[PDB]
RNA sequence: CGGUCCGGCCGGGAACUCAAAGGAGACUGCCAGUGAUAAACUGGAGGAAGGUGGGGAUGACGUCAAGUCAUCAUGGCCCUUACGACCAGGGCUACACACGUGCUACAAUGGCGCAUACAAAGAGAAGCGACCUCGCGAGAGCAAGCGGACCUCAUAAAGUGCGUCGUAGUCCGGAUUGGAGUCUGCAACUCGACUCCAUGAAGUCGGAAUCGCUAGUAAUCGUGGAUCAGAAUGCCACGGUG
C-alpha cells in the first residue's frame, strides 16, 4: 500500500491526539483526516471521522492500528 | 582542428539553399569542405479530433518534418572563419556550431 | 572484379557478391544452415541456382539487414538474380520466366483512423 | 458536406506559412502563445488600418513582424510616429527586441481578408447583405480575379430563421492544389447575433 | 503416498505432485525439493520411505492444509468484527479490492437471478 | 473555462516555483537519505504545513487561450480545437496535413 | 464480383514434393498465419500415413482424396419467396478444394492426441471411405439426388 | 586494401546498404483477339512496376430545425451579500439488473523449462537514464553518455532446437480472496499501478440472432507514442509470419 519509509499522520490530528492523552478523554474528536494511519497512542479514544456529510464516531481498538480512519466511516449509502 | 555546423529547418527547399550558401562561401575562401551530409528527417506526427464534441472516427492528422544538414569544414582559415561569420542566413534556419 | 546485385523484399535489404569457384554461401559472417532455421527459406535462395546451373561453379558472399525470415530469404533471391545478370545478361529470359527479377512491392498497409487495423473495421451494432 | 480549409490544405504547395520561425519542443509552446498575443494587439490596434496579413519570423533572439496592410500611411504615421509606439510594446510582449516591416497590399479587392472585413464592417453599418456581396464580387472580377465566391451565414437582415446565402462568379476550383486560392473568414457582430463571412478568390493555377 | 495434510499425492512428477497440498504452489514445491535433495522430474515410484519423510519434515515449516484454511478464515473474520470497509464487503459478498459493481462482479456476487 | 478556474492555475504555478522548486524538494530528498536521520526528521510533517497548491502534481495542463482542461498538446500549449484553427491559418510552423 | 471478373491466385508449390495441390492443403490446415507449424503437421501426418499404408506418399493422399471428392452440389436460390435448391455440377478445381476442406475439418473434430495423428487417421478412414469427411460428400449427394427435378 | 586486443575497431575506401534533396519512368504507348473500322475490355511482350501499379490526403448542390451556447465566440433570457467566489471531506468508481464495444480463455496448430535466429517506427534535459552494486522480485543506491543516424528507453515476440506433460476441469484457464511489499505523489481507506508468497471461480468452443475482411488483406505475434506526477485490455502508429 505505502512505502516502509514512515507511516502517514496529519499534524493537526496528531496534536489533537497529544492534547487528548494529557488532558484526559473528552467528547468525540471532530476530524476530516481520513488519510491518516492509526497509531498505538490512539487506542481508547473516540475519533469523529467525516463521511462527506456527518462525523461518524469510531472507538479506537488495538486491532485498528495500521489501518486508515476512513475504513471505519462508510461514504456511500446503499439500501 | 575541425568546425562542425548542424542545420535545422522545417522547410527543405530553405535548408539546402542556406547550406549551399555556407558550402560555397567556405570552398571559395579556400577550405576543405566535407558534406552537405543529409541526416535523417524527424517526422513528429499529431492526430487531433476535428469535431468540438463527440464524432470519434473523424480526425485531422499533421506532421512536423525536422530536416537536418551537416557541413564539416576541415581548414579553419581566418579568410573562411570571418566570411562564414558575416553571412546573412535565413531566420527560419537554426545553426549549431561545434568546435 | 566482384559481380554485384542488390535485392529487396518488404523492409529487408540484401547485397549479393559473385566470384567463380565452389558452392559456398556466407550470410552475415555465418553459414546458410546457421542463419535460417527453416528449409523453405533455404530453398528460395537455392531457386536462382536451378535454371542457371551451379553445383560448385560460383561462390556467394551475402549480407542482409531488416525484416524477417522470409523477408530476408526473399530479398537475397532478388539479389542473386541481379548479380547473375551482372555476370551474363543473356540469363534475363530464364529469370523472367521464374519471376525472380520482379521486386515484390507488397508492403504492410498503414493503420487507418477509425479502423482497428489496416482494413479491420470495428464491430457494427444496429441497436 | 464538410470542406477542407482552403489555406491549410495548400500550405507548402502554393500557399506560405504565416509563422516562418524555427524552435524545439522546449520553446515551441512559449513562442506560439507569444505569436498569438502579438497578433491580438495589432489586430485590435490597427483594426481601422485595414490589416490583411501578419508574418512573424524569429531571427536568433529577436522578432521580425511583417504587417501586410492596405493603408500603410496610417500604420506608419508621421515619419515613423505610429511604427515606434507599436515596436515598443511588441518588444514588451515578445520579451526579445522587435523590428516591424510594413508590406503594401496593392489591390485590396483581391485580398480575401480585406474583402471579408469590408462585408463584415458593412453589415454592422446596417447595409443590405445582397448589395455588399454583389459589390465584393463585381469589384474582384473587374480587377482581374479569375474567380470569386462569397458566403454569409446566420440571421440575415435580422430574420428569426438563420440562412446561408452565397454568390459565385467565374472559376473556383477548390480541388486543384496547383490553384492559388486566397481564403479568409470575418465575423460581423450585429444587434441580432453573429454573421459569418467566407470569401474564396481564385487568382489562377501554378 | 501421503504427505502432512492427510492428502494422497498421485503418481505423477514430484513438483506437480506437491502442488496438491493447500499452501504449496509452484515456487514452494521447487524450494522443498531443492532443500531435501530430490529431483523435480522424478515420479513417486523409486522414491522410498526414506525420501518421503525428509519432504514431510521440510513441508512442516510452512502453515499448510487445515492449519492454513483457519488462518485465512481468521484474518477474514478479524476484518468483519473490526467494522472496516474490507470487512463489510466480505459480509455483503461483493468485490473487496475496489472492482466495479455496475457490471461484471459475478465471481463474488454469484450467478445472476431476475 | 471559468475565469476563477483560470485564476486557480495562476496561483498553483506561482506557489510551485516559490516552495516545491527550491525548498520542498530539499526536504523530500532529505526524506529519502538512508545514511542520515532514520527517525527524528519532522520533514514528512513540515511538508503538510506548506500550501497544497505548491505541489507541482496539483497543476492541470490547460489551453493557453481558451482554458480547456481536456484535449491538450504540450508541443503547442493548446487544445485540439485551437491547434486545428491555428494550423489551418499557417500560424503553426512546419505543420501541415500529413499522408503516408 | 458483380462487375469485376477476377481470375485465381497461383500459389508457389510444396517445398518437399513440388505439388501445388499440397500447397493448397497446407494453407487450408494453416491457422493464425503459421506456415512453419502447418507444413510440420502435414508432413508428419503423411510420413505416418504412407508408412502405415504401403508408401507412395503422393498416391496415398490421392486415394483418400478420390473418396471425398464431390461431383454435384446444391445452390440456394429464392425465386418466388420460396428458397429452391438447384443442383449444379462442381468445377474440377473446386472439387479438390472442398475434398481437402472437409478432411481438415473432420480431423479437427477428432479426439486423438495430436493434429498429425488426427489428420493421418482421417486420411486412413477416407482411403477406405468410412469417416466424417466421406459422410459430408454423402449428405451433399442425397441433397442433390432429391432436388434432381429442379436441375 | 595495410594492422590486429578478432570489436569497422584504426588508417583508409567512396564501391555498396542506408540517409534526403533533385531527376527519369507507365501513356492502353506497342502487338493480337473481341467490339459499330469507335470507346473500351481481354490476353501477350518489354519492364522494378500495366491498365486509377499499392496506400493516403482531397468529401460537389444539398439532406436530417441532425451534434456542439460545457473549447471558444455570440442575440435574447435568468442570478448578481448569489446560479458568483474560497476551503476541507465526499461523489463522478454506488449495484436487484438489461444492452453495446473490447480483453483473456476453454488448450496439444497448446502449456512449461532451457538454448537461440530475424524487425519497423517512435520518445527524451523539471528528461531518456547505461555500467556496477544490493534485493527471489517490483525496485533501490551509486553514477556514464545523450538535447541525440553517435547515448538511453530496449531483451522484439511469434518462429526454430531439445526435454517434459499425454486429452485429465488437467503442468489448460486465470477470476476471486488472504498475507507481505515496491514506486509515484502533501496524501494511494473510499479509489493507482506493479511485484512476491499462497489461493485456483466460471469456462471442455457459446440459442434465437449477428459482425469484420478481396492480399501483404483476414488471422495471429510482438514494438512504440500522445494525454500523463502516477494511472491503457481504449485510442493512434509500427513491422514479423501470412
Ligand atoms: Mg496448491
Ligand atoms: Mg469565459
Ligand atoms: Mg493531473
Ligand atoms: Mg524521389
Ligand atoms: Mg480528386
Ligand atoms: Mg434538434
Ligand atoms: Mg498456468
Ligand atoms: Mg473493396
Cα–Cα distance for residue pair E97/E107, rounded to 1 Å: 13
Q: CA nearest B4: which of B64, B66, B65, B68?
A: B68
CA of C117 to the centre of ligand 6 (A): 35
Task: Find the DSSP H helices in A1-79.
Answer: 11-22
Q: Which residues are within 8 A (CB) of C90 and not within 5 positions of it... i.e. 6 or more apart?
A: none
CATH of residue D152: 3.30.1140.32
Q: In this structure, what C-alpha cell is assigned to residue F12?
A: 498553483
Q: What is the dihedral of CA E26, E31, E34, E36, to 10 degrees?
A: -110
Q: In this structure, what C-alpha cell is assigned to residue D194?
A: 453573429
Tell me, yes or no, whether D7 lies in a domain.
no
Q: Cell numbers 485590396 label which residue? A: D108
Which H or E element spans position E108?
A: helix E106-109
Q: Give the largest Cα separation in chain B, rounded.
A: 63
Statement to judge: residues D66 and D122 lie in one domain: no
Q: In this structure, what C-alpha cell is assigned to residue G16?
A: 518437399
In this structure, is the dihedral angle defined by the CA atoms of residues G24, G28, G34 and G40, taken in order, positive or negative?
negative
**Residue C88 CB-half CA count within 13 A:** 13
Q: Which residues are within 8 A (CB) of E20 and not within 5 positions of it... i.e. 6 or more apart?
A: E7, E9, E10
Q: How many CB atoms lie within 10 A of CB A65?
A: 15
Q: In this structure, what C-alpha cell is assigned to residue E14?
A: 514430484
Method: X-ray
Q: What are phi and psi of B12, to 5 degrees?
A: -75, -45
Query: Helices D25-45 and D81-94 sit at what angle, rounded to 10 degrees?
Result: 150
In this structure, is the dihedral angle defined by the CA atoms of residues G114, G119, G122 and G124, taken in order, positive or negative?
negative
D171–B contact, CB cutoff 8 A? no
Q: Are E9 and E1 in contact (CB under 8 A)?
A: yes
* CA-based nearest residue in chain E for residue A58: E83
Q: In this structure, what C-alpha cell is assigned to residue C36?
A: 535460417
My answer on whether omega of the bond before D112 falls inside 30° of 0, hence cis, is no
Cα–Cα distance for residue pair E49/E42, rounded to 1 Å: 15
Of F78, F88, F91, the CB nearest to D19: F91
Q: Are D46 and D76 in contact (CB under 8 A)?
A: no
Statement to judge: residues D174 and D111 lie in one domain: yes
Statement to judge: residues D152 and D82 lie in one domain: no
Cα–Cα distance for residue pair C101/C78, rounded to 1 Å: 6
Tell me the CA–C1' distance in angstroms for G3 and H218. 23
Statement to judge: residues D120 and D93 lie in one domain: no
Domain, as residue range, for D141: 107-206
**Structurally, how many domains does chain D consist of?**
2
Q: What are phi and psi of B71, to 5 degrees?
A: -120, 120
Cα–Cα distance for residue pair E64/B57, rounded to 1 Å: 55
Cα–Cα distance for residue pair A78/F78, rounded to 1 Å: 42
Of D16, D18, D22, the CB nearest to F91: D18
Strand order in the sheet with D164-170: D164-170, D147-153, D193-202, D181-190
Statement to judge: residues D94 and D145 lie in one domain: no
Q: In this structure, what C-alpha cell is assigned to residue E16?
A: 506437480
Bridge partners, F53 (sequence order): none
* CA-based nearest residue in chain A for residue E80: A72
Statement to judge: residues D169 and D91 lie in one domain: no
CA of E15 to the centre of ligand 5 (A): 68
SS (H, E, C) C19-33: EECCCCEEECCEEHH
Statement to judge: residues D32 and D77 lie in one domain: yes
**Residue G50 CB-half CA count within 13 A:** 13
Q: Give the largest Cα separation in chain A, rounded.
A: 42
Statement to judge: residues D113 and D205 lie in one domain: yes
Closest nucleotide (C1' vs CA) to G44 is H109
Nucleotides of H under 7 A from a protein CB: 15-22, 42-43, 46-49, 53-63, 65, 67-76, 84-102, 108-110, 117-126, 140-141, 147-149, 156-161, 163-167, 171, 175-179, 181-193, 196-201, 210-220, 226-229, 235-242
Closest nucleotide (C1' vs CA) to A32 is H89
> What DSSP string describes F29-42?
HHTT-SSS-SS---
Query: Helices G92-108 and G132-146 sit at what angle, rounded to 10 degrees?
Result: 130
CA of F54 to the centre of ligand 3 (A): 14
Tell me, yes or no, whether D34 lies in a domain.
yes
What single DSSP character describes residue D4?
Answer: P
F67–D contact, CB cutoff 8 A? no
Bridge partners, D102 (sequence order): D67
Cα–Cα distance for residue pair E88/G30, rounded to 1 Å: 53
Domain boundary residue, one of D106, D131, D161: D106
Cα–Cα distance for residue pair B18/B12, rounded to 1 Å: 10
Tell me the CA–C1' distance in angstroms for F58 and H229. 9
Q: Are B58 and B51 in contact (CB under 8 A)?
A: yes
E strands, chain G, where?
A: 72-78, 83-89
Q: How far is CA C1 from CA C59, C62, C89, D188, G140, in A?
A: 13, 16, 16, 77, 66
Collapse the DSSP code of F95 into the 3-class scheme (helix H, G, I; strand E, B; otherwise coil) and give the result: strand
The C-alpha angle E60, E61, E64, rounded to 5 degrees, equals 60
Give the pairing type, strands D164-170 and C30-31. Answer: unpaired
Q: Which residues have their alpha-adjacent CB atom under 5 A from ion ligand 1?
A: E 19
CA G56 to chain centre: 20
Tell me the CA–C1' distance in angstroms for F13 and H229. 15
Statement to judge: residues D74 and D94 lie in one domain: yes
Contact A6 F48 (CB under 8 A): no
What single DSSP character describes residue C109?
Answer: P
Q: How far is CA D201 from CA D17, D69, D174, in A?
A: 18, 18, 10
Cα–Cα distance for residue pair D79/B91, rounded to 1 Å: 28
Q: CA nearest C108: which of C117, C100, C116?
A: C117
Cα–Cα distance for residue pair E76/F6, rounded to 1 Å: 48
Distance from CA of C115 to the nearest CA of B (A): 8
Q: In this structure, what C-alpha cell is assigned to residue A46?
A: 473516540
CA of F60 to the centre of ligand 3 (A): 5
Tell me the CA–C1' distance in angstroms for C34 and H116. 11
Domain boundary residue, one of D79, D106, D133: D106
Cα–Cα distance for residue pair A12/D69, rounded to 1 Å: 64
Q: Are G25 and G13 in contact (CB under 8 A)?
A: no
Cα–Cα distance for residue pair F94/B64, rounded to 1 Å: 5
Closest nucleotide (C1' vs CA) to F50 is H186
Cα–Cα distance for residue pair A31/D152, rounded to 1 Å: 62
Q: Which residues are within 8 A (CB) of F86 and not within 5 positions of it... i.e. 6 or more apart?
A: D32, D36, F76, F78, F92
Give the pairing type, strands C58-65 and C25-27. Answer: parallel
Collapse the DSSP code of B65 into the 3-class scheme (helix H, G, I; strand E, B; otherwise coil) and give the result: strand
Q: What are phi and psi of F40, to 5 degrees?
A: -90, 80
Give the pairing type, strands D164-170 and C3-9. Answer: unpaired
Cα–Cα distance for residue pair B76/B3, rounded to 1 Å: 7
Residue E64's region, left for phi above 0, alpha for psi from -120 to 50, else beta, is beta
Cα–Cα distance for residue pair C69/C29, rounded to 1 Å: 17
Collapse the DSSP code of F50 into the 3-class scheme (helix H, G, I; strand E, B; otherwise coil) and give the result: coil
Statement to judge: residues D93 and D160 lie in one domain: no
Statement to judge: residues D118 and D157 lie in one domain: yes
Bridge partners, D11 (sequence order): D15
Give the pairing type, strands B93-98 and C12-20. Answer: unpaired
Q: How far is CA C56 from CA A5, C20, C24, C27, C63, in A?
A: 72, 9, 8, 17, 20
Task: Find the DSSP H helices in D23-128.
Answer: 25-45, 72-76, 81-94, 112-123
Q: What share of chain B is helix, strand, coil (3-state, %, to 5)?
A: 25, 45, 30
Cα–Cα distance for residue pair E11/E43, rounded to 1 Å: 6
> What is the number of the ligand closest to the CA of E16?
1
**Residue D88 CB-half CA count within 13 A:** 6
**Residue E68 CB-half CA count within 13 A:** 13
Q: Are B11 and B91 in contact (CB under 8 A)?
A: no
Cα–Cα distance for residue pair G94/G97, rounded to 1 Å: 5
Closest nucleotide (C1' vs CA) to C68 is H118
In this structure, is the dihedral angle defined by the CA atoms of residues G8, G12, G13 and G15, taken in order, positive or negative?
negative
Q: What are phi and psi of E110, to 5 degrees?
A: 100, 175
Q: CA nearest D183: which of D133, D117, D113?
A: D113
D7 neighbourhood in chain F, CB within 8 Å: 88-90
Residue G91's region, left for phi above 0, alpha for psi from -120 to 50, else beta, is beta
Q: Are G112 and G121 in contact (CB under 8 A)?
A: yes
CA of F6 to the centre of ligand 2 (A): 9
- With b for 16 or more beta-carbon neighbours within 10 A and e for fewer, the G67-106 pattern comes to bbbbeebbeeeeeeeeeeeebeebeeeebbebbbbbbbeb
Q: CA nearest B25: which of B97, B99, B86, B96?
A: B86
Tell me, yes or no, whether D2 lies in a domain.
no
Cα–Cα distance for residue pair F55/G61, rounded to 1 Å: 75
Give the resolution value in Å: 3.1
Tell me, yes or no, whether D6 lies in a domain.
no
Tell me, yes or no, whether D8 lies in a domain.
no
Q: What are phi and psi of B38, to 5 degrees?
A: -85, 105
Tell me, yes or no, whether D120 lies in a domain.
yes
Q: Which residues are within 8 A (CB) of G128 and not within 5 positions of it... i.e. 6 or more apart?
A: none
**Residue A18 CB-half CA count within 13 A:** 7
Q: CA nearest F79: which of B46, E49, C22, A62?
A: B46
Q: Are B89 and B17 in contact (CB under 8 A)?
A: no
Cα–Cα distance for residue pair G32/D57, rounded to 1 Å: 54
Q: Long-range contacts of range G114-121, CB-CB < 8 Å, 24 or more positions apart?
A: G114/G41, G115/G29, G115/G41, G115/G45, G116/G41, G116/G44, G116/G45, G116/G48, G117/G45, G117/G48, G119/G29, G119/G41, G119/G42, G119/G45, G119/G49, G120/G45, G120/G46, G120/G48, G120/G49, G120/G52
Domain boundary residue, one of D106, D135, D156: D106
Interface chains of chain G (3 or more CB pairs under 8 Å): C
Give the pairing type, strands F72-73 and C12-20. Answer: unpaired
Statement to judge: residues D89 and D113 lie in one domain: no
Cα–Cα distance for residue pair A68/E35, rounded to 1 Å: 41
CATH of residue D89: 3.30.300.20
> What DSSP string describes B11-35?
-HHHHHHHHHHHHHHHHHTS--EEE
* CA-based nearest residue in chain G for residue C69: G36
Domain boundaries, chain F: 1-90
Strand order in the sheet with A55-59: A29-31, A46-50, A55-59
Q: How many CB atoms lie within 10 A of CB B22?
A: 23
Cα–Cα distance for residue pair F28/G136, rounded to 1 Å: 75
Tell me, yes or no, whether D36 lies in a domain.
yes
Which H or E element spans position G133?
A: helix G132-146
Which H or E element spans position D149?
A: strand D147-153
Cα–Cα distance for residue pair E33/E40, rounded to 1 Å: 7
E strands, chain C, where?
A: 3-9, 12-20, 25-27, 30-31, 58-65
> What is the number of the ligand closest to the CA of B12?
4
Q: Are B76 and B3 in contact (CB under 8 A)?
A: yes
Q: Are C7 and C78 in contact (CB under 8 A)?
A: yes
Q: Cell numbers 508457389 label which residue? A: G12
Amino acid at each position: 500500500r505505502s512505502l516502509k519509509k514512515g507511516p502517514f499522520i496529519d499534524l493537526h490530528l496528531l496534536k489533537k491526539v497529544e492534547k487528548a492523552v494529557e488532558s484526559g478523554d473528552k467528547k468525540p474528536l471532530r476530524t476530516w483526516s481520513r488519510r491518516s494511519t492509526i497509531f498505538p497512542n490512539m487506542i481508547g479514544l473516540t475519533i469523529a471521522v467525516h463521511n462527506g456529510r456527518q462525523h461518524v464516531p469510531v472507538f479506537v481498538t488495538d486491532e485498528m492500528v495500521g489501518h486508515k480512519l476512513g475504513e471505519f466511516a462508510p461514504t456511500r449509502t446503499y439500501r | 582542428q575541425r568546425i562542425r555546423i548542424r542545420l535545422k529547418a522545417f522547410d527543405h527547399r530553405l535548408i539546402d539553399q542556406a547550406t549551399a550558401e555556407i558550402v560555397e562561401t567556405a570552398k571559395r575562401t579556400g577550405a576543405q569542405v566535407r558534406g552537405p551530409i543529409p541526416l535523417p528527417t524527424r517526422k513528429e506526427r499529431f492526430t487531433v479530433l476535428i469535431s468540438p464534441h463527440v464524432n470519434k472516427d473523424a480526425r485531422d492528422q499533421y506532421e512536423i518534418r525536422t530536416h537536418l544538414r551537416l557541413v564539416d569544414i576541415v581548414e579553419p582559415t581566418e579568410k573562411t572563419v570571418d566570411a562564414l561569420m558575416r553571412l546573412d542566413l535565413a531566420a527560419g534556419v537554426d545553426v549549431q556550431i561545434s568546435l | 572484379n566482384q559481380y554485384y546485385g542488390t535485392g529487396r523484399r518488404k523492409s529487408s535489404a540484401a547485397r549479393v557478391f559473385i566470384k567463380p569457384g565452389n558452392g559456398k554461401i556466407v550470410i552475415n559472417q555465418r553459414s546458410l544452415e546457421q542463419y535460417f532455421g527453416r528449409e523453405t527459406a533455404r530453398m528460395v535462395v537455392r531457386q536462382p541456382l536451378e535454371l542457371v546451373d551451379m553445383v560448385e561453379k560460383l561462390d556467394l558472399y551475402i549480407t542482409v539487414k531488416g525484416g524477417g525470415i522470409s523477408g530476408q530469404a526473399g530479398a537475397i533471391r532478388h539479389g542473386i538474380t541481379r548479380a547473375l545478370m551482372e555476370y551474363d545478361e543473356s540469363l534475363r529470359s530464364e529469370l523472367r520466366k521464374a519471376g525472380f527479377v520482379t521486386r515484390d512491392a507488397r508492403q504492410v498497409e498503414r493503420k487507418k483512423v477509425g479502423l482497428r487495423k489496416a482494413r479491420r473495421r470495428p464491430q457494427f451494432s444496429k441497436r | 458536406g464538410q470542406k477542407v480549409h482552403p489555406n491549410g490544405i495548400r500550405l507548402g504547395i502554393v500557399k506560405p506559412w504565416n509563422s516562418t520561425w524555427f524552435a524545439n519542443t522546449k520553446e515551441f509552446a512559449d513562442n506560439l502563445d507569444s505569436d498569438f498575443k502579438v497578433r491580438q494587439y495589432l489586430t485590435k490596434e490597427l483594426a481601422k488600418a485595414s490589416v490583411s496579413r501578419i508574418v512573424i519570423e524569429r531571427p536568433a533572439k529577436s522578432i521580425r513582424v511583417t504587417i501586410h496592410t492596405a493603408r500603410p500611411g496610417i500604420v506608419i504615421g508621421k515619419k515613423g510616429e505610429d511604427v515606434e509606439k507599436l515596436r515598443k510594446v511588441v518588444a514588451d510582449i515578445a520579451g526579445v527586441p522587435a523590428q516591424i516591416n510594413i508590406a503594401e497590399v496593392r489591390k485590396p479587392e483581391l485580398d480575401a481578408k480585406l474583402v471579408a472585413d469590408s462585408i463584415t464592417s458593412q453589415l454592422e453599418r446596417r447595409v443590405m447583405f445582397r448589395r455588399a456581396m454583389k459589390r465584393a464580387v463585381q469589384n474582384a472580377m473587374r480587377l482581374g480575379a479569375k474567380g470569386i465566391k462569397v458566403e454569409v451565414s446566420g440571421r440575415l437582415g435580422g430574420a428569426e430563421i438563420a440562412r446561408t446565402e452565397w454568390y459565385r462568379e467565374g472559376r473556383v476550383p477548390l480541388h486543384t492544389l496547383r490553384a492559388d486560392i486566397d481564403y479568409n473568414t470575418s465575423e460581423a457582430h450585429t444587434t441580432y447575433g453573429v454573421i459569418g463571412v467566407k470569401v474564396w478568390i481564385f487568382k489562377g493555377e501554378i | 503416498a501421503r504427505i502432512a495434510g492427510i492428502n494422497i499425492p498421485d503418481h505423477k512428477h514430484a513438483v506437480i505432485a506437491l502442488t496438491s497440498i493447500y499452501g504449496v504452489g509452484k515456487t514452494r514445491s521447487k524450494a522443498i525439493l531443492a532443500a531435501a535433495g530430490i529431483a523435480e522430474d522424478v515420479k513417486i515410484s523409486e522414491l522410498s520411505e526414506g525420501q518421503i519423510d525428509t519432504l514431510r519434515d521440510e513441508v512442516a515449516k510452512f502453515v499448510v492444509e487445515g492449519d492454513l484454511r483457519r488462518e485465512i478464515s481468521m484474518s477474514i473474520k478479524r476484518l468483519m468484527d473490526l467494522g472496516c470497509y474490507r470487512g463489510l464487503r466480505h459480509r455483503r459478498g461483493l468485490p473487496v479490492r475496489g472492482q466495479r459493481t455496475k457490471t461484471n462482479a459475478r465471481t463474488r456476487k454469484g450467478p445472476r437471478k431476475p | 473555462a471559468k475565469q476563477s478556474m483560470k485564476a486557480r492555475e495562476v496561483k498553483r504555478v506561482a506557489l510551485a516555483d516559490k516552495y516545491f522548486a527550491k525548498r520542498a524538494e530539499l526536504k523530500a530528498i532529505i526524506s529519502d537519505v538512508n545514511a542520515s536521520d532514520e527517525d527524528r526528521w519532522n520533514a514528512v510533517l513540515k511538508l503538510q504545513t506548506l500550501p497544497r497548491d505548491s505541489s507541482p502534481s496539483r497543476q492541470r495542463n490547460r489551453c493557453r487561450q481558451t482554458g480547456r482542461p481536456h484535449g491538450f498538446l504540450r508541443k503547442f500549449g493548446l487544445s485540439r480545437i485551437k491547434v486545428r484553427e491555428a494550423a489551418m491559418r499557417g500560424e503553426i510552423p512546419g505543420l501541415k496535413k500529413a499522408s503516408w | 464480383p458483380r462487375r469485376r471478373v477476377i481470375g485465381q491466385r497461383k500459389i508457389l508449390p510444396d517445398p518437399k514434393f513440388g505439388s501445388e495441390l499440397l500447397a493448397k492443403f497446407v494453407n487450408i490446415l494453416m491457422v493464425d498465419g503459421k506456415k512453419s507449424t502447418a507444413e510440420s503437421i502435414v508432413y508428419s501426418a503423411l510420413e505416418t500415413l504412407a508408412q502405415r499404408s504401403g508408401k507412395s506418399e503422393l498416391e496415398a493422399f490421392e486415394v483418400a482424396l478420390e473418396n471425398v471428392r464431390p461431383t454435384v452440389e446444391v445452390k440456394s436460390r429464392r425465386v418466388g419467396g420460396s428458397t429452391y435448391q438447384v443442383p449444379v455440377e462442381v468445377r474440377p478445381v473446386r472439387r479438390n478444394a472442398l475434398a481437402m476442406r472437409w478432411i481438415v475439418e473432420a480431423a479437427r473434430k477428432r479426439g486423438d492426441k495430436s493434429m498429425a495423428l488426427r489428420l493421418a487417421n482421417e486420411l486412413s478412414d477416407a482411403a477406405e471411405n468410412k469417416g466424417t469427411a466421406v459422410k459430408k460428400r454423402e449428405d451433399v449427394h442425397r441433397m442433390a439426388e432429391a432436388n434432381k427435378a429442379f436441375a
